[PDB]
Amino acid sequence: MFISRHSGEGKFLFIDQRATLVIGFLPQEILGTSFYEYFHNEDIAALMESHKMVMQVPEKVTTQVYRFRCKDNSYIQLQSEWRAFKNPATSEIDYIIAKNSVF
C-alpha cells in the first residue's frame, strides 16, 4: 500500500507520501540505497530471481510475500508488483515501478 520506484539495479529513486509511515525511513535515509539493503536473509535469493525476471521481460512480476527490514530493524511483510520500462533508443531501464502491498 505504498509506491516506490527504483533504478534497473534496485536503487531507490522515489517513495510516495505513505511509505515512511509503513517502513520508518525518511526519503533522505532510503533514496540512493539498494533494495538489497532491506530484504530478510530468508527472502533475498528468491527476490533476486524476481528482479532478474523484471529486467529481462517487459511484463509485471509479482514477488512472493517477503520480509522487509524497517528503520527500527524489525521486519514487516510486503508483496510487490514490479515492472521495468526501457528507453526504446538505448535499451537501458529508465525505472522500475513497485506497488508494495502491506500485511
Swiss-Prot record:
Q: Which residues form a coiled coil?
A: none
User: Tissue specificity, please?
Assistant: Expressed in head and ovary.
Q: What happens when the gene is disrupted?
A: Cyc mutants don't display PER and TIM cycling, and are completely arrhythmic.
Q: Which domain of life is it from?
A: Eukaryota
Annotated PAS domain residues = 2-58
Q: Where in the cell is it found?
A: Nucleus
Q: Where is the PAC domain?
A: 63-103
> What do we know about how this protein assembles, alone or with others?
Efficient DNA binding requires dimerization with another bHLH protein. Forms a heterodimer with Clock in order to activate PER and TIM transcription.
As for what it does, the entry says: Putative transcription factor involved in the generation of biological rhythms. Activates cycling transcription of Period (PER) and Timeless (TIM) by binding to the E-box (5'-CACGTG-3') present in their promoters.
What protein name does the entry list?
Protein cycle
Q: Which organism is it from?
A: Drosophila melanogaster
Organism taxonomic ancestry? Eukaryota, Metazoa, Ecdysozoa, Arthropoda, Hexapoda
